[PDB]
Amino acid sequence: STAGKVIKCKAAVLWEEKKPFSIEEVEVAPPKAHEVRIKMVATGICRSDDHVVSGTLVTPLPVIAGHEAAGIVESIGEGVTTVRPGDKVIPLFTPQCGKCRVCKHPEGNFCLKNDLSMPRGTMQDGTSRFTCRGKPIHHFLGTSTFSQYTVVDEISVAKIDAASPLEKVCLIGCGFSTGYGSAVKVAKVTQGSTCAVFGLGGVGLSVIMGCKAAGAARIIGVDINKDKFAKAKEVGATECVNPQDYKKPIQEVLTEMSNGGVDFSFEVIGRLDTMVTALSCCQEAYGVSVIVGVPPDSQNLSMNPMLLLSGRTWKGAIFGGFKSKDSVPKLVADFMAKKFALDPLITHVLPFEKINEGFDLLRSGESIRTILTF
Amino acid sequence: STAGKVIKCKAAVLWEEKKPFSIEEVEVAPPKAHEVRIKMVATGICRSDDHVVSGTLVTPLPVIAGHEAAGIVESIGEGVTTVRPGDKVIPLFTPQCGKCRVCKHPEGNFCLKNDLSMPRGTMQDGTSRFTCRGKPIHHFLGTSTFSQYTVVDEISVAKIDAASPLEKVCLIGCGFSTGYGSAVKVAKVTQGSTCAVFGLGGVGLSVIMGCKAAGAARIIGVDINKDKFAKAKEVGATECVNPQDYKKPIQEVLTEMSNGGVDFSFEVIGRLDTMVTALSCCQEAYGVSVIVGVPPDSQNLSMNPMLLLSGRTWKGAIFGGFKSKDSVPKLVADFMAKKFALDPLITHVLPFEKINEGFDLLRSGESIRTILTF
Numbered sequence: 001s002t003a004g005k006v007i008k009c010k011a012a013v014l015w016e017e018k019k020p021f022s023i024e025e026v027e028v029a030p031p032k033a034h035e036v037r038i039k040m041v042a043t044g045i046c047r048s049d050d051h052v053v054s055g056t057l058v059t060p061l062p063v064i065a066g067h068e069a070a071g072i073v074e075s076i077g078e079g080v081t082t083v084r085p086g087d088k089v090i091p092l093f094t095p096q097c098g099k100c101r102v103c104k105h106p107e108g109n110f111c112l113k114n115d116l117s118m119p120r121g122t123m124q125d126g127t128s129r130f131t132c133r134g135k136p137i138h139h140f141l142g143t144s145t146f147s148q149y150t151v152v153d154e155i156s157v158a159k160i161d162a163a164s165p166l167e168k169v170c171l172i173g174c175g176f177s178t179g180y181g182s183a184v185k186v187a188k189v190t191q192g193s194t195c196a197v198f199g200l201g202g203v204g205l206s207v208i209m210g211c212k213a214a215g216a217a218r219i220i221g222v223d224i225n226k227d228k229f230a231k232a233k234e235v236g237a238t239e240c241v242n243p244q245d246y247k248k249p250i251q252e253v254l255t256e257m258s259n260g261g262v263d264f265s266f267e268v269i270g271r272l273d274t275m276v277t278a279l280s281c282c283q284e285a286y287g288v289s290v291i292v293g294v295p296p297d298s299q300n301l302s303m304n305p306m307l308l309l310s311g312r313t314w315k316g317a318i319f320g321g322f323k324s325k326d327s328v329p330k331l332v333a334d335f336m337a338k339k340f341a342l343d344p345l346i347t348h349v350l351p352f353e354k355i356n357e358g359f360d361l362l363r364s365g366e367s368i369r370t371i372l373t374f
Numbered sequence: 375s376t377a378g379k380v381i382k383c384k385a386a387v388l389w390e391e392k393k394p395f396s397i398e399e400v401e402v403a404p405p406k407a408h409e410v411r412i413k414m415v416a417t418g419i420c421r422s423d424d425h426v427v428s429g430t431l432v433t434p435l436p437v438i439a440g441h442e443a444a445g446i447v448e449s450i451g452e453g454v455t456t457v458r459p460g461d462k463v464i465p466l467f468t469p470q471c472g473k474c475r476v477c478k479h480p481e482g483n484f485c486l487k488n489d490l491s492m493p494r495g496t497m498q499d500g501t502s503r504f505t506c507r508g509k510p511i512h513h514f515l516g517t518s519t520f521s522q523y524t525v526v527d528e529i530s531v532a533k534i535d536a537a538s539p540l541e542k543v544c545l546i547g548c549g550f551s552t553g554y555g556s557a558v559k560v561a562k563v564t565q566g567s568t569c570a571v572f573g574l575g576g577v578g579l580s581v582i583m584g585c586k587a588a589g590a591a592r593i594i595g596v597d598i599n600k601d602k603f604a605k606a607k608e609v610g611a612t613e614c615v616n617p618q619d620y621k622k623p624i625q626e627v628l629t630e631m632s633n634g635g636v637d638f639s640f641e642v643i644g645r646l647d648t649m650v651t652a653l654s655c656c657q658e659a660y661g662v663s664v665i666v667g668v669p670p671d672s673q674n675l676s677m678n679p680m681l682l683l684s685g686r687t688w689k690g691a692i693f694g695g696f697k698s699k700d701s702v703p704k705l706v707a708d709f710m711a712k713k714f715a716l717d718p719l720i721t722h723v724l725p726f727e728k729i730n731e732g733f734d735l736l737r738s739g740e741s742i743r744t745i746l747t748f
């Protein structure tokens with residue numbers, strides 16, 4: 001039994017920006033009150049984990065990254081009531097405390113206990129459960145899933161179906177839920193509408209899935225890598241366009257194609273220029289544009305507010321607008337009942353020990369999601 | 375008899391930017407097919423008319439400005455079916471053709487026949503009905519209400535109750551409808567919510583009226599002119615703040631006052647900086663901010679898109695989101711049935727010959743709405 005004891009295990013530690021991960025031994029403390037220690041089973045490689053390496057997404061270093069994952073509870077701290085040893089779980093990078101003004105609001109999901117807005121890289125109590133080479137290591141988004149074992153606060157974990165295939169449903173911990181919810185919950189895509197989706201990676205393909213589920217008549221995929229078009233069409237895109245093929249700006253192209261602007265547009269990349277382009281291509285009187293991508297830290301965009309005065313709506317969201325702990329178990333149940341598919345997002349599988357090759361695949365443009373198995 | 379003949383009458387001509395209006399004789403041609411010639415009875419002085427003088431709003435000069443008014447039909451051109459000679463009418467600076475994609479959409483109101491996006495300063499047929507000293511004079515937003523007689527396209531006029539008081543209901547042609555609709559239709563203010571309103575002129579006071587009608591619990595007025603506060607409280611503000619009284623940015627003040635950000639905020643001034651401040655002060659996960667003010671031509675704002683990624687919604691609108699020809703007659707009927715008040719907006723009632731004095735009252739901070747009577 002390991003309950004109440006320190007666990008020594010392997011993790012992928014990031015000591016420095018712009019360097020490979022280091023797979024080495026870490027010490028994982030036992031859970032304190034209202035904490036849960038999880039044996040990880042599978043984790044996806046999401047572009048936000050790469051943003052930590054590139055310095056796009058700022059969080060304290062050294063760190064154990066990873067936020068899209070699934071595993072099995074090893075032990076629970078005092079007072080935990082929502083999970084037990086042996087349960088299958090998904091860590092929640094957006095917590096759901098259930099008690100703050102956001103958690104009590106009908107639409108809000110960005111719980112005030114989050115570690116996203118002004119990151120500390122700690123547990124809720126301001127301390128760390130990890131040491132490596134005798135030095136304390138930061139957490140990432142309260143989850144730190146690039147480790148054989150992690151410790152999370154109870155408000156950052158959801159119990160899921162015991163029969164769930166963890167190597168698939170890890171994607172409900174970030175990319176699938178974010179893109180799908182951005183379409184069905186945040187934008188509220190309507191039947192018969194025209195949508196434009198900028199960026200055709202795992203999250204943008206999930207936005208396409210949600211637009212098709214909502215009954216859109218036209219779904220235009222936009223990417224500078226034409227090798228992403230075939231899979232976009234498989235999951236519902238009706239047409240795809242590469243901005244590099246055109247002499248005019250793509251907002252003009254899209255407005256012409258849609259006979260005056262699209263109903264719904266989505267930025268699913270992380271660039272300031274494509275956020276403004278995506279807003280401009282929606283119809284000026286009644287269009288809606290949703291920002292999903294994460295841009296380089298602390299940088300401001302420039303835009304003309306007359307784009308809004310005519311009638312456009314501009315919004316963003318984290319995790320598809322879903323209240324995390326209520327929604328994740330229901331999304332897994334819907335997956336088990338074949339209400340949506342996850343296999344189209346999975347292009348590569350590797351053992352955890354080959355995490356750096358998995359990041360190389362993402363950076364080269366070759367992969368959508370690589371799933372790592374422990 | 376004036377029907378079918380050129381009319382000579384007085385108008386306020388603006389020959390160049392940054393000069394007083396010239397009150398002099400103009401010639402007004404008879405209406406062509408699908409056009410309506412109107413004898414003006416009352417017109418309000420709105421800040422957007424002043425924006426033409428100051429160069430904030432670019433439109434072809436020389437011009438007859440004025441867009442908030444009410445009058446009586448003098449004659450109709452061939453083919454007109456919606457008004458007749460002797461009817462009371464309000465000119466519509468946002469048209470409603472009924473046939474374009476926007477007019478057919480459930481939410482949109484920015485009809486594609488508008489002269490707001492890329493102003494030509496003409497009738498729909500690309501010509502002008504006004505001459506002055508032998509020279510052609512431009513129209514303004516298809517309305518040109520600063521003249522004893524004007525000619526408007528049929529899609530730019532609504533028939534209203536024959537018993538309505540024209541010296542009051544002229545406000546339904548711009549300021550009342552814009553502010554009220556921005557609250558009740560565009561933002562969709564909810565019962566029990568907290569609202570912040572930036573700018574306490576005629577339009578901002580109308581936003582307050584709409585927030586109170588919608589059941590808001592708290593309505594915080596924001597203005598650098600504290601002389602505006604008493605009237606704001608009379609029409610529903612619960613508190614008023616002056617940014618110049620504080621050592622920290624007003625977005626921080628308003629976030630603290632609202633225990634973490636307001637539900638709804640409104641920019642009703644026309645400044646880039648207050649547009650970004652108003653967005654920032656709404657709650658980061660579920661707040662909504664609406665731009666109503668018109669800022670200086672061709673100038674971009676700078677903002678951090680993380681303000682939207684957390685969950686905020688940013689939108690703007692023209693004319694409160696109301697489909698103009700359908701809505702104006704109903705708003706007049708609602709006024710006649712005592713559903714809202716217009717008197718609180720009116721501080722001064724002057725003859726038309728005093729237009730320049732009326733603009734000086736607005737610029738000095740001393741008036742809300744001056745109504746000019748012909």
Ligand SMILES: NC(=O)c1ccc[n+]([C@@H]2O[C@H](COP(=O)([O-])OP(=O)(O)OC[C@H]3O[C@@H](n4cnc5c(N)ncnc54)[C@H](O)[C@@H]3O)[C@@H](O)[C@H]2O)c1
Pocket residue numbers: 046047048051174175178198199200201202203204222223224225228243268269270271274291292293294295317318319320368683
């Ligand atoms: N808001 C949230 O809650 C949330 C959660 C999921 C991920 N993220 C963000 O979502 C974004 C997408 O993540 P992903 O894992 O799908 O990434 P990804 O890298 O797999 O996909 C991005 C796609 O954008 C395309 N692209 C890059 N530059 C482009 C340009 N200039 N024009 C057009 N296309 C361009 C790429 O070719 C690529 O296919 C990232 O910024 C990530 O950080 C946000």
Ligand SMILES: NC(=O)c1ccc[n+]([C@@H]2O[C@H](COP(=O)([O-])OP(=O)(O)OC[C@H]3O[C@@H](n4cnc5c(N)ncnc54)[C@H](O)[C@@H]3O)[C@@H](O)[C@H]2O)c1
Pocket residue numbers: 309420421422425548549552572573574575576577578596597598599602617642643644645648665666667668669691692693694739742
């Ligand atoms: N979107 C539309 O359809 C629409 C229709 C109505 C008018 N407009 C615009 O609405 C705005 C308001 O019009 P109005 O007639 O009520 O104007 P107004 O001049 O009567 O009122 C503006 C108010 O803003 C306050 N103000 C100015 N600078 C400020 C600052 N830095 N901080 C705080 N308060 C400040 C002033 O003291 C004043 O009370 C204008 O820009 C006008 O052009 C837009």
Ligand SMILES: [Zn+2]
Pocket residue numbers: 095096097098099100101102103111112113
């Ligand atoms: Zn919470």
Ligand SMILES: [Zn+2]
Pocket residue numbers: 046047048049067068174175
């Ligand atoms: Zn992610």
Ligand SMILES: [Zn+2]
Pocket residue numbers: 469470471472473474475476477485486487
């Ligand atoms: Zn129309």
Ligand SMILES: [Zn+2]
Pocket residue numbers: 420421422423441442548549
């Ligand atoms: Zn106006």
